[PDB]
Amino acid sequence: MLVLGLNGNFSAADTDVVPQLGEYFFHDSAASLIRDGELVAAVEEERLNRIKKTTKFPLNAVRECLALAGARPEDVDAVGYYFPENHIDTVLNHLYTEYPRAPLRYSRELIRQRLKEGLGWDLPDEKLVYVPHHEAHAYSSYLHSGMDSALVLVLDAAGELHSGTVYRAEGTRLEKLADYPVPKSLGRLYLNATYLLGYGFGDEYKVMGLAPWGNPETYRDTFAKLYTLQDNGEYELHGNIMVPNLVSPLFYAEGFRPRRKGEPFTQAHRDFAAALQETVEKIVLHILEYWAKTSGHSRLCFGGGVAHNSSLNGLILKSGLFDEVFVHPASHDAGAGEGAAYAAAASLGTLERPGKRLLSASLGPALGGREQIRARLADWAPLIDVEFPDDAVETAAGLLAEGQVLGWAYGRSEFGPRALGHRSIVADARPEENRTRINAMVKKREGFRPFAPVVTAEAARDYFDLSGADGNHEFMSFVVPVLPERRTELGAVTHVDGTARVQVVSAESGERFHRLVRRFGELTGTPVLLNTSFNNNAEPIVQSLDDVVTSFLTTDLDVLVVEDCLVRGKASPDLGVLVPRFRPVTRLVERRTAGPDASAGAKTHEIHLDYDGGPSAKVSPELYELLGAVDGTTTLGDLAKTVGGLSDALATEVFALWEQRFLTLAPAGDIGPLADDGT
Amino acid sequence: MLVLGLNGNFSAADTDVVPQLGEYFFHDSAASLIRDGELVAAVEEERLNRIKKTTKFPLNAVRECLALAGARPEDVDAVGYYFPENHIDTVLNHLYTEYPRAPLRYSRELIRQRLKEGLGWDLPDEKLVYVPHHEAHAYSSYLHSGMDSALVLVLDAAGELHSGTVYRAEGTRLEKLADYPVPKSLGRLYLNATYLLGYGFGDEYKVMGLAPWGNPETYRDTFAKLYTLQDNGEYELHGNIMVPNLVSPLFYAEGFRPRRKGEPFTQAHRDFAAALQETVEKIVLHILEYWAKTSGHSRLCFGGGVAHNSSLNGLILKSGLFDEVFVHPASHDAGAGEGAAYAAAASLGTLERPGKRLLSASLGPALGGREQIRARLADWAPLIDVEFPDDAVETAAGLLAEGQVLGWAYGRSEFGPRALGHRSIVADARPEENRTRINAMVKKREGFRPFAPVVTAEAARDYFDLSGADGNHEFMSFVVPVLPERRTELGAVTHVDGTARVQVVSAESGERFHRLVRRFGELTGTPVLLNTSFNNNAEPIVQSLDDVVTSFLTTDLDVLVVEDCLVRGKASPDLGVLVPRFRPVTRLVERRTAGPDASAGAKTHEIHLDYDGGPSAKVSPELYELLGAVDGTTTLGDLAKTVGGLSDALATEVFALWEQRFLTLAPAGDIGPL
Ligand SMILES: NC(=O)OP(=O)(O)OC[C@H]1O[C@@H](n2cnc3c(N)ncnc32)[C@H](O)[C@@H]1O
Ligand SMILES: NC(=O)OP(=O)(O)OC[C@H]1O[C@@H](n2cnc3c(N)ncnc32)[C@H](O)[C@@H]1O
Ligand SMILES: [Cl-]
Ligand SMILES: [Fe+3]
Ligand SMILES: [Fe+3]
């Protein structure tokens, strides 16, 4: 029983179905593959087209999943899509009325066209199954829990009918107990508020990170005017007719000032985050207190995008409402993509389910075999120095004990937003200094952002308070207090309220990463490391060896450990050997605007990425002339010859474009097809 | 007592308050000036910045109104703005949360900044008055009616609180009788439906013109699912939670396929428009049947943007529900700007009002004095031939009788969307082939579109069925039946259903235009002309002399009559003497996207206008190089020398960009102050 689960919109690599298609129109595209009831492969398209939370059709994700499964497209028994057909087609139809030049192609025709043109795959109509959105979420969260029965709660921003749903799950059977309508979305509430802080879609985790720095008393009475808790676990959100934002009109009327780009976070801003987080917590605990008592159940699965609020999950864990709580690594729409595969199989006979609780999210493409990796690392010679230690974990453990910050790339990439030791950046977890050192310098993000610890299963309870229930910690789903007697010891991974988004690694969840942290513990007396995602501020988590090396070379990391090779950056790297390549969304433009006196203004030049929210950057006339000749094969050095050579000024200008990922820059050729490692 | 009325957003000429500010965020910007109760000047900003239904701050309109009144900024006693302060600021606040780079400037600071930087006018806080939106519509529509008591209905997309409001008016006082919430908007319903016919904001009256070609029965039962009439003049619209469009999900579920831009209008499209138009008529007449008998009024003023639905007005006229009906020429938000002035005046003293029913919309800037018009037409000599007939009206009537299609430009431009004899295109109303060609060749628009007649007041009842109530026909507010025995004769202006959006012109409403129509009637026996607005498909109604000549030369008009000068295009027009200028929104781009094997794709060049909805067009490599050197003073002939002479292909390529208004082309100099 081999079933593809699909989520996201339908745009091609280089264009969107409607020009500048909204980034909120079916985001976090992904593909999942199940076989005989198990999740055999899953990867978000963002890892492959390098567009954070992309909406584009997950064609690459499908190709990669089929390769990991050793399947042809025609081997696939069914395809599940994470919304009902009439709902997606109604939304598409609405986009088409707003863009009258777009041809009338609805989801079924588009899915078949993308697979046909992309994979030579001729999908028969009977193999495509469309699925209720909250059902998809519920299957994904509950079926990987290892539980045989559970209360299931789903809370997200937009199901077709509901923003919230409560189920009773038993075996492979879901029974809806309650629902909440779309305008009551707590995910929409959170996003609406997030905009008042100078942030936008995808920044919710930043707002959650900020909230402990604020006082929830300041705006508590203001938020009280936006919701009311009611009997039987009901609530209302109080809308308005003025703007599509629940929160902005009232806060404007009380003098709140939305944060501007590049501005600092005032105490008003910090307190707003704190009150927003406490609001969503109170409503969800209101829901769960009622449905715990009413259903009688002791086990909870929590899905939907809202279940990436690990602070909320920590409060659910400590509430004492449940004995067990499970949360999936990909609880946002990529998880509904997986769930849709299971719902498609259920629609076509009895449902085969996973045999055990999910412990590892290592499910995307691997980096490649040792032969092809070495070969490719050699293409990078003009830029890096490679060692081959005897025990790369031992060497890495010592280097971390020495105080270095490591890139750590091994095996199959993580499904969902957290890095868990397959595409990670790791450092010593004890010195506070590592916080501003990694935030400001190497990862280039805001300072209030705390860092997440990874600890061995054996030492977990010597450092963290996991009480209140038995939650799953392999995926950093839960924020838990750090025990007071360990707070100062864990100076880098302890938030202001003494809490931490802990990963608990085991020989089961990740043998190599468990070995690393254990071995570090023996060397140091503290088996806890800092673990943050391996990417800079302009890209999602790195996927390929090339992505890994590129990201190493464009951040200030000390050493990179990638499949037992120890990589360092040469003294002066020769950028001239790299071959520049446009991304599918790269645009290069010379512009003239209207001058005063109604002349043609003077030429300016820019590069940008053509998707909604895509970045943009000025380029010098000289780099514009160089980039216009990019052919995909000639090296940067050789292209620069046409403008007098790759001078230090040009190389610096190119490097800064590289850091923002406007172009692909890598040695000639590729690493070739990913080899059969025999697993 | 001198009061300025304002409406629109606050964007400058070249930038918008937020980048790509949506075209619906405070559109139809305009300024109005009232002195001693009388509307002395009014013009929409679109006529001056040449962006249809523009949202930009009406800076040029304010300056032009002050000049027409002979007033200085410091003379203005008050300024009214057509929405409450908190409402417009809440919307601005929302846009700022979506665009965190934009600084937190709200409407009071923005309005005073635009006036100070734009006019040198430091406006004190106490002179700025914000006004309820439907109250502003109501004042405008009622105070110009000539009536001393009336029922006043306002229907539009949305005021700050309501989609519709019903008032009692007596003397100068408005008292509210009823209101309808924002989700019940009939304006929003009609605009939602308009999006299904491949159209957008501003196109509603095209859908209106399509409706008589459709059968209203096909989708009647479908539309019946989106509204319910209730007792005592109430009604409800049934929304949905999938998409922000009331209409599209239901019609999708029944297999409706929204027309694509540049595809024909199928019979299902036509039937869709006909059922839509019937639906809104049913609901409005339901509202008005209740409130006429309840309020006791025999007279009705109807305003708000929905009052530009001339078909609806004609059914209100024939309904027998009222003895009299008045509709203002500018019932959309420009008219709300004017009403904001009256409300501002009322809050700062007693309220002076118009002495008479408004008969003329000729309220914008004029074309200029006779000598500056003659001198400026001389500057255009390399492209035009000019005659100076003894009696231009006499000559024009004869040319019309010989089958010529005339541009007609005189005096002050029309306020509101209809051309009424000051910026008009006119032709013989009799041959049906005139509608076919003027649609295809001159206005360059869809063949289904009807044409509106102008008739003399003395012959109106010989041709049209005006009966029922007494409505005002000076501004083409009402669709009326053409008399059956005249439908054959009026081949070009009788719509498929036998109706016509008539302008009845009189010596009092437009003396010169009336003389033209009367004289044409004397020559031919038919005192009726076709009268369409003087603009091509790429511009709003022409304003200045250079606008009129530009439009004449880039439309396929036979002859232009402008302030008694007879203008025709030269056999070979020398485009090289024209000085190209960028418009403030013109952008010139050389672009590369990704190509094969992740290469840089091949260069392309394009020109575009930088506003939401703005057009774009490809340009050749060599025109791109030419336009890159535009300095605003050098002629196109001199500019083309750098690229090796003004080729015949370059001139042709330039002419087509001129026709689409991507740049300004005009002889050196200008007409000077008017
Ligand atoms: N159907 C659909 O909309 O996709 P989805 O399941 O991925 O839900 C995303 C929603 O979860 C909310 N959300 C996401 N992350 C969140 C976080 N860390 N904290 C609070 N809310 C969050 C987010 O604001 C957004 O409203
Ligand atoms: N409300 C506001 O902000 O400005 P406003 O007074 O100018 O109203 C615009 C509204 O009039 C509606 N509208 C315009 N023309 C229309 C027509 N011919 N038929 C129906 N509705 C029309 C249009 O669809 C739109 O919903
Ligand atoms: Cl591994
Ligand atoms: Fe979801
Ligand atoms: Fe209005």
Strands laid side by side in the B586-592 sheet:
A616-618, A604-609, A586-592, B586-592, B604-609, B616-618
Q: How were these coordinates obtained? A: X-ray
Among B97, B183, B630, select the one facing A196 at the smallest CB separation. Answer: B97
Q: How many interchain CB pairs under 8 A, A with B?
A: 188
Beta carbons of B58 and B29 less than 8 angstroms apart: yes
Contact predicate B557/B573, CB 8 Å: no
Within 8 A of A629 by CB-CB distance, chain B residues are 600
Bridge partners for B414 per DSSP: B362
Rounded CA gap, B219 and A473, in Å? Answer: 57
User: What angle (nearest 5°) sits at the alpha carbon of residue B581, between those of residues B576 and B584?
Assistant: 160
Considering only CB atoms, which chain B residues are within 8 Å of A583?
Answer: 594, 598
How many distinct helices (H) and strands (E) make up chain B? 21, 28
Q: Tell me the C-alpha to C-alpha distance, in Å, between residue A567 and each of A60, A368, A388, A562, B342.
A: 28, 16, 9, 8, 76
Tell me how crowded residue B244 is: count the other CB atoms within 10 A of its CB.
Answer: 12
Pocket test for ligand 2, best of B191, B203, B208, B245 (most atoms within 8 A of CB): B191
State both tokens at B442: 């001159």
For residue A196, the chain B residue with the least C-alpha distance is B97
Q: Which atom of ligand 1 is nearest to the CA of A205?
A: 18
Instruction: Give contacts of B584 with chain A, Cβ < 8 Å.
Output: 594, 598
Residues of chain B with Cβ-Cβ distance to A182 below 8 Å are 241
For residues A76 and A68, give the distance between their C-alpha atoms in angstroms, rounded to a whole number: 13
Resolution to 1 decimal, in Å? 2.1
- Rounded to the nearest 10°, the torsion over CA B179, B183, B185, B190 is -170
Nearest to A587 by CA among A647, A662, A660, A655: A662
CA A654-A660-A662 angle, 5° bins: 70
User: In whole angstroms, what is the distance from residue A191 CA to residue A201 CA?
Assistant: 7
Q: Which residue from A87, A103, A597 is facing B242, i.e. has the nearest CB? A: A87
C-alpha span between B182 and B162 (Å, rounded): 5
Number of other CB atoms surrounding residue A261 within 10 Å:
9
Rounded to 5 degrees, what angle do the CA atoms B212, B213, B215 make? 85
- Give the chain A residue nearest B256 (alpha carbons): A93
A427, A404 Cβ separation under 8 angstroms: yes
Count CB atoms within 10 A of the CB of residue A1.
15
Q: How far is CA A158 from the centre of its chain?
A: 18
For residue B199, the chain A residue with the least C-alpha distance is A100
Atom of ligand 1 nearest to the CA of A187: 26
| Cβ-Cβ contacts under 8 Å, B583 against chain A | 594, 598
Alpha carbons A514 and A527: distance in angstroms, whole number: 10
HEC sequence for A12-62? CCCCCCCCCCCCCCCCCCEEEEEECCEEEEEEEHHHHHCCCCCCCCCHHHH
**Chain CA centroid to CA B462, Å:** 30
> A190 CB less than 6 Å from ligand 1?
yes
State if residue A252 touches ligand 1 by the CB under 6 angstroms criterion: no
Cβ pair A73, A120 in contact under 8 A: yes
DSSP state of B448: T
Would you call B90 and A244 a contact, using CB atoms and an 8 Å cutoff?
A: no
Cα within 13 Å of Cα(A459), Cβ side? 23
**How would you write A71-107 as a 3-class SS string?**
CCHHHCCEEEECCCHHHHHHHHHHHHHHCCCCCCCCH
Phi, then psi, of B646 in degrees rounded to 5: -70, 90
The three-class DSSP label of residue B71 is: coil
Residues in chain A closer than 8 A to B607 (CB atoms): none
3-class DSSP state for residue A337? helix
Are B80 and B8 in contact by the 8 Å Cβ rule? The answer is no
Considering only CA atoms, which residue is closest to atom 5 of ligand 2?
B305
Q: For B662, phi and psi rounded to 5 degrees?
A: -75, -25
Residue A220 and residue A282: Cα distance in Å, rounded? 11
CB contact under 8 A, A600 and B587: no
Centroid of ligand 3 to alpha carbon of A364 (angstroms): 12
Stated as kind and residue range, the H or E segment containing B1 is none
The answer to whether A125 and A85 are in contact (CB under 8 A) is: no
Contact A485/A339 with Cβ under 8 angstroms? Answer: no
Residue nearest to atom 22 of ligand 2 (CA): B306
Q: Which residues of B16-41 are buried (b: 16+ CB within 10 A; e: fewer)?
A: bbbeebebebbbbbbbbbbbebebbb
Distance B127 CA to ligand 5 centre (A): 23
Query: By C-alpha distance, which of A209, A204, A205, A208 is closest to A191?
Result: A204
The chain B residue lying nearest A14, using CA atoms, is B594
Which residue in the block uniquely carries the two structure tokens 């780009």? A261
* Closest residue in B to A197 (Cα–Cα): B97
**B1 neighbors B349 (Cβ within 8 angstroms):** yes
- Rounded to a whole number, what is the distance in Å from the CA of A358 to chain B's nearest CA? 34
Cβ atoms within 10 Å, residue B351? 18
- Relative to beta strand A406-409, strand A559-562 is parallel
CA distance A260 to chain B (A): 5
Q: Are B627 and A260 an interchain contact pair (Cβ–Cβ within 8 Å)?
A: no
Residues 6+ apart with CB under 8 A from B321: B285, B288, B289, B292, B300, B469
- Pick from B591, B606, B589: which is nearest to B660 by CA? B606
d(CA A30, CA A52) in angstroms, rounded, equals 12
Q: Residues lining ligand 2, CB < 6 A? A: B 156-158, 187-188, 190-191, 204-205, 208, 304-306, 308-309, 332-333
Question: What letter would DSSP give residue A588?
Answer: E
Contact B603, B590 (CB under 8 A): yes
A84, A56, A172: which is closest to A611 by C-alpha?
A: A56
Q: How many CB atoms lie within 10 A of CB B634?
A: 16
Best B93, B105, B251, B633 member to test A by mutation, with max A CBs in 10 Å, is B93
Dig out the tokens for A19 from the structure.
């020009």
CA-nearest residue for atom 18, ligand 2, is B309
B268 φ, ψ to 5°? -70, -40
A136 vs B313: CA distance, rounded Å: 52
